[PDB]
Recover the amino acids of this structure.
């Protein structure tokens, strides 16, 4: 059993939190994190990008927190990745699609 | 880009159930049973598998595949690496059909893996390129 | 200073969890819970409906869907915040989320 | 339909800071905080306010029962206030109940609460002086009627 799952809020607020949870039977060696667009981890973004990541120190979890939200952020493809001893698993979301639904 | 996440104290054994250890000459060998390593996990901007460093827990000594050979650089695993490959980054992958066994591929030298090699009475950690090769299979104890 | 927000998964799975969280400035007297369709709390559903609720003792209530049917996918699912003011509600229809 | 969610130990006091208690004759009365039960247990003044979920959300549905009593729950049966012999139930299959009140913040005063009878809309718990006593009564609603305003104090 291996999977990665994103929970998103049904509506935008001033502080938006996306919750990424992985599920992996490789208990000591599994983790999740976010990639913004094609290839930027949150660590790589310029300061005040509006993105913050909270990686929880097997059900690995990483929350992505969006503040001062722009249209670029609303339309950005946001990916959560599960890493473990097997091929990486990804799930993604574009918020404007959820919020405009 | 590689960003450090979490580390784990680890005992590594080769295909013969021999434990990896560093000897007096600072050489990585395997013996039936200094033996405590740290496997540090990294997030990757280009997800290809589990990126790790291997360092000696009793530090600063980090495993390197520089120049297609095995060495231990005097350094700690870094907070980040601003590149998509590194002589100290290996991809840790489970063995097809054997979830309990792991292989470590050099990120710098694709197709090259950590291996155990018998040399006379000694068993040495080496880097090398035989499908199902057992010599590149390890178990990791946490 | 008062809100209710639902977090939903971007894709359907065998077990689906919807997370409802309330935020109220009446901290001693606030709770959230789910209403299925017009007026059924989870307790009122026929047995083995596929809906379960977990109330956390900010208030939280998770709604857990299993053996999901098309009626469940299209059901209006409402989370209610209760506190000393008038109830505040937020709702979701999962099929809208999943087909976007 | 009301479904019980959680219960909280509470003390209630009118705007004169007189505390609600149950007396030796099973009557809900108010006494000066000065003279209120001072025991850590506070058996005669500690109430359980039990919060209920509602199939028809109209406010915070609650029962009010005596914490130290085997089975004593406040009731508005017949437009009068008594301690009815029962415990707050797991559920009530009804949209109104003589033991359910809606706990609502006072208009313009978030820190104060009023308790509206679910059985008798527009009727509220009130503190009323009768001879030397201060009684808990049910009285019809006049905005800013201060006799129906309470402070609800957690544990």
């Amino acid at each position: 059993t291996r999977s990665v799952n994103i929970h998103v809020p049904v509506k935008e607020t001033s502080k938006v939190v996306l919750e990424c949870r992985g599920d992996s039977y490789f208990r000591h060696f599994s983790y999740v994190y976010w990639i913004i667009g094609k290839n930027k981890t949150v660590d790589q973004l310029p300061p005040n990008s509006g993105y913050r990541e909270r990686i929880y120190l097997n059900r690995p979890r990483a929350d992505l927190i969006l503040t001062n939200i722009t249209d670029e952020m609303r339309n950005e493809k946001l990916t959560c990745v599960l890493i473990d001893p097997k091929d990486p698993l990804k799930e993604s979301v574009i918020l404007s699609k959820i919020w405009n639904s | 880009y590689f960003g450090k996440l979490e580390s784990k104290l680890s005992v590594i054994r080769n295909l013969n159930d021999q434990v990896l250890f560093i000897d007096q000459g600072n050489r990585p060998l395997f013996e039936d049973m200094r033996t405590i390593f740290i496997i540090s996990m990294y997030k990757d901007s280009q997800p290809r598998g589990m990126a790790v460093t291997i360092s000696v827990a009793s530090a600063a000594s980090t495993l390197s595949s520089e120049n297609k050979i095995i060495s231990f650089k005097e350094m700690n695993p870094p907070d980040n690496i601003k590149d998509t490959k590194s002589d100290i980054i290996f991809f840790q992958r489970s063995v097809p059909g054997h979830d309990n066994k792991m292989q470590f591929e050099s990120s710098s030298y694709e197709g090259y893996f950590l291996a155990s090699e018998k040399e006379r009475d000694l068993f040495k950690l080496i880097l090398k390129k035989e499908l199902g090769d057992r010599s590149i299979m390890f178990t990791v104890q946490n």
